[PDB]
Amino acid sequence: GVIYGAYLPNLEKSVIPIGTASESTEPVNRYQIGVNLAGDAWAGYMSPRDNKFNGSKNFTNYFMYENWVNYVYSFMVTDVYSPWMQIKRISQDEGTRNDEIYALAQIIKIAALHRTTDMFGPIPYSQVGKGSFKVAYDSQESVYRSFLKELEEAVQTLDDYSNKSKEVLPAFDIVYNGDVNKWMRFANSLMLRLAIRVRFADAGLAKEYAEKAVKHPAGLINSKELAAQMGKGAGLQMKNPLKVINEEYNDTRMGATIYSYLAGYNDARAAVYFVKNNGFKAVRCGIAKSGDAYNGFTRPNVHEDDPLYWMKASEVCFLKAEGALAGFDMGGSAGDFYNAGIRMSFSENGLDNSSAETYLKDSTRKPANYTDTSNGELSANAPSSITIRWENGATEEEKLERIITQKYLAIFPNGQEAWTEWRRTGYPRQIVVAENKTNSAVLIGNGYDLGGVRRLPYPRTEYEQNGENLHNAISQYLGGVDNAATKVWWDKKSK
Amino acid sequence: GVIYGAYLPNLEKSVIPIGTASESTEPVNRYQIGVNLAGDAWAGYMSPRDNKFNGSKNFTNYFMYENWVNYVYSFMVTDVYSPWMQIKRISQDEGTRNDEIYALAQIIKIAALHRTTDMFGPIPYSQVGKGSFKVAYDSQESVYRSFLKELEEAVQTLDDYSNKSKEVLPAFDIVYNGDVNKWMRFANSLMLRLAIRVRFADAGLAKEYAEKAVKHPAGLINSKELAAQMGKGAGLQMKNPLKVINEEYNDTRMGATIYSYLAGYNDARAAVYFVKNNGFKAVRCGIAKSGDAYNGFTRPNVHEDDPLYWMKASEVCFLKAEGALAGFDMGGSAGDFYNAGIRMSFSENGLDNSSAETYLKDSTRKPANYTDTSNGELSANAPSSITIRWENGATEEEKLERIITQKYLAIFPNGQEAWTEWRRTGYPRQIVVAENKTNSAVLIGNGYDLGGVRRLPYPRTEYEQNGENLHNAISQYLGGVDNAATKVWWDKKSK
Known part of the structure; x- marks a missing residue:
């Protein structure tokens, strides 16, 4: 179906902004604003080399800059729906239906849009x-x-179709080259993520779908060869946007929060994730303009053709670990999936198993204090004292802290997901911002269950062209308050 | 003989509108308005792809559009009586009579006119x-x-004639190529249908003629090969009007009501009656204009030369089942005829007996709920929970429900008869209309014994040229009220 060759790649490239060489730098700018200066900053993964953007009033110090919010909404809504609608029209509303193609598009749409609703809260959906x-x-x-x-419906359609053929649009699918089995595994894995997410809002819904996902016969993403990623596929080569932000823009450095955990635990992944050289030097988020102060500080270790992951196998293990802790039928204890998640993450990062075993048995090392060699006034104490080795007798909160802190280290550099899980659970505990320039009532908070960015406010463009509908959503679902301090529906633990 | 070649085929083509390739589309339009958008809609077999006819005010949402009623009355009355009168004039009112030809003409006339009176109630008949x-x-x-x-008189005439010759106007009879025996079987089978119809108005009349029909030595239609249909005959080829409505006009889709039963029962006839694809997607009757929403939904599975059936063999079995339930001497129990009817329908649809046996022994499957994936507001619960397998200890209503619901599936796509039987018995229970734009006091009702279209109102043409006689009929037989909410004589159970 050559007709689908235009829309499918575009839909996949809209999930997390990325493109080919001819297409790059433009989407890199979307990635920089929507991820690198958003979730990456707020989850403590990375900080700007120099906080100079918009006269030093931007997402990193909680100023929800209107131009950036308009931009983010646009690429997280319009760019996802446009190609999806065209695929739906051709596959469902013209001639003979092609349900397998629509099921594929639906899986990719949800891969993109769950990030959009996690970002804004209520969104246009069923009436689009x-x-x-x-x-x-x-x-x-x-x-x-x-x-x-x-x-669930998408997986059923593909399972029925698997009897007929093992491939769907293979020449145009960048992620799995049309492999139907791999798509079912991703869809099941994504269902598990989204089920765990709703635990605190509705434990019954969480149980229903977490159990459906882990019990479905098609399986889950349980090896690195099955990971959902954008790299090489369908004859194309995606270009890692973080490499461009790092080398060409010189705009990003190692975050103080992730440093605390990696350095404190003497984590072997630190040197895979960041360029170690003589030693690590991290930058704190939410600080004043500093010029060339952090030029010699640690940069991310990323290359031009490094894949960008929608979902790694290690994440599934930590989701099952939490589902186990929650009392769901995951087919294992929380401790066993936790340890397996750590082993998988080391494998995913090219580390040997002996290193992984030594790491997961470590019960003495704690997160490190943060020292800023350029500005001592920005130094901070470790945000947590949680150790690695699993403890069956620990409190339920301590068990959760370990699971989410280790998942956080496994899913790096997916800052959007890291930020979402921090909002939902409070973990891993963050080193709070040094300065707050918010225009949206955001609190510095405690880096755990209070404060931080809880959502992006709605874009001005929605106030200008869809104001009646927007007012109804804000009134009905956000308690009348459209700001970054307001919580979304699944965010039910925080204060 | 040649004299009758002009009138007999015209009379047979007026029973249910259909014609050869040269005279098609005009009669397709009669079939579309008189069956597809009338009985098929009200019985729940099919719904329009897009309810756009007459600014979305038409039969499907209970608006009895004057232009359509005039049209329907004209082809259900004038088109039947014209050729019949000429056959009568020549076969009875001129010198040497020909009683066998008149007998044949009478049987065909009644085949047409029983539908006309079922549609309108009182009609011109004896004074014509x-x-x-x-x-x-x-x-x-x-x-x-x-x-x-x-x-009865027609059959008696043909029986006397059968001793002299086995054929009547063989060169011009499209239905049975002049086979006198096959015509006697159809006459007896039609008598049975009309006998059971009058049960609730006059049980004595029903018993008299139901028993006459099943005891007559000529027999009934007891095999697919004896079915009364319009397809290939007398050297002519009829063209299925539903195929034209489906492919050329793109105006029809699977109904939500028949979906509930076919899908819920995992019925192997579903894929024979409708084009399955991945699965079925049905459309609810009595809804607003929807543009291209239902373009990809399920279409009827029908071809250019598929016969159109006045009466299938399986219906005879379901009439006997009910006659036995009513206490008449049918020569068998209600359950035995019920099961035979199911096996017969499966054979009629080219399905093997193993399928039929598994189906009729199914005591757990229930009609499915209806989900409209394009518009969630149109979703509805299953209209019934009746299961397939016969139960001797069921209530008399439950036994009737089973018989009528299975007859309904067997006689598809005869919407006129399906609608007539729903009015008479309340079965199968329907998914009620979503919107009511009636101009004729029709109630949405409960899809069972209350509401729905009870008849067509009389045409304006009759008010304009036969007003005094019409008034007398309305005053005497319709309680002074000529609207679609008023009931006809055989409709005695409903409220």
Whole structure:
């Protein structure tokens, strides 16, 4: 189906902004603003070399700059829906239906849009594409319930189709070259992520779908060869946007928060994730303009053709570890999946198993204090004292802290997901910002269950062209307060 | 002989509108308005792809559009009586009579006109032919009593004639190529249908003629090869009107009501009646204009030369089942005929007996709930929970429900008969309309014994040229109220 060759790659490139060589740097800018200066900053992975953007008032110090919010909404909504609608029209609304192609597009749409609703809360969803320019907003709750149901339906369609053929649009699928089995595994894995996410809002919904995902006969992403990633596929070569931000823009450095954990635990992944050289030097997030102060500080270790991962195998293990802790039927104890998650992450990073075993038995090392050699006034104490080695007799919160802190280290550099899990659980504990220049009521907080960016505010463009519908969503679902301090539906632990 | 070649085929083509390739699309339009958008809709077999007809105010949402009623009355009355009167004039009212030809013409006339009176109630009948277009109406009761007596006399005439010759106008009869024996079987089978129809209005009349039909030595339609159909005959090839409505007009889709039963029962006839693809997607009747929403939804599975059936063999089994349930001497139990009807329908649809046996022994499957994936507001619960397998200890209503629901699936796509039987018994229980734009006091009702279209109102043409006679019929037989909420004589159970 050559007709789908234009839309499918574009839809996949919209999940996490990325493109080919001819297409690059433009989407790199979307990645820089929507991920590198957003979730990466707020989750403590990375900090700008120099906080100079917009007169030093930007996402990194909690100033929700209007131009950036308009931009992010645009590429997280319009760029996802446009190619999806065209695939839906051709595969479902013209001639003979092609359900397998629609099931594929649905899986990719949810891979993109779960990040969008996690970012903003309520979003246009069920009413999109029904002939109206002004579109009504769905509650985040209904969107998540729909995601879970759509993924299950998508997997069933592909499972029925697997009897007929093992491939769907192979010449145009960058992720798995059309492999139907790998798509079912990703869809099941994504369902598990989204089920765990809703635990605190609705434990019953979480149990239902977490158990469906782990019990489905098609399986889950359980090896690095099955990971959902954008690198080489369909004859194309994606270009890592973080490499461009690092080398060409010289705009990013190692974050103080992730340093505390990596350095404290003497973590062998530190040298894989960042260029160690003589030693690590990290930058604290939410600080004043510093000129050339952090030029010699640690940069991420990333190359031009390094794949960008929607989901790694190690993440599935930590999701099952938490599902086990939650009382769901995951087919194992929380401790066993936790240890397996650590082993998988080391394997994923090219580290040997002996190193992994020694690491997961470590019960003495704790997160390190942060020292800023350029500015001692920015030095901070370790945000946590949690150790690595699993303890069966630990409190439920301590068990959760370990699982999420280790998942956090495994899923690096996916700052969007790291930020979401920090919002949902409070982990890993962050080193709070040094300065707050917010225009959206954001609190410095305690780096755990209070404060930080809880969501992006809605874009001005929605106030200008869809104001009635936006007002209804804000009133119904955000308690009348459209700012970054307001919590989304699944965020039910924080204060 | 040649004299009858002009009138007999025209009379047979007027029973249910259909014609050869040269005279098609005009009769397709009669079939579309008189069956596809009337009985098929109200019985739940099919719904329009897009409800756009007459600014979305038409039969499907209970608006009895004047132009359509005039049209329907014209082809259900004038088109039947014209060729019949000429056959009568030549075969009875001129010198040497020909009783066998008139007998054949009578059977075909009743095949047509029982649908007309079921549609309108009282109609011109006994006073037709003598004086003008100003003809007095007969009560439906008198018309039915006459039908039953006329069929018996017709069969008696053909029986006497069978001793002299086995054929009548073989070169011009499209249905049975002049086979006198096959015509006698159809006459007896039609008598049975009309006998059971009058059960609730007059149980004595029903018993008399139901027993006459099943005891007559000529027999009934007891095999697929004896079915009364319009396809290949007398050297002509009829063209299925549903195929044209489906492919050329793109105007019809699977109904939500029939979906519930076919999908819920995992019915192997579903893929024979409709084009399955990945699965089924049905459309609810009585809804707003939807543009391209249902373009990809399920279409009927039908080809250019597929026969159109006046009566299938399996229906005879379901009529006997009910007759036995009513206490008549049918020569078997209700359960035995019920099961035979299911096996017969499976054979009629080219399915093996192993499928049929597993199906009729199914005591757990229930009709499915209806989900509209394009518009969640149109989703509905299953209208019934009746299961397939016969139960001797069930209530009399449950036994009737089973018989009628299975007859309904067996006689697809005969919407006229399906609608007539729903009005008479309330079965199968329907998914009610979503919107009611009625101009004729029709109630949404409960999909069972309350509401729905109870008849077509009389046409304006009759108010304009036969007003005095029409008024008398309305006053005497319809309680002074000519609308679609008023009931016809045989409709005695409903409220």
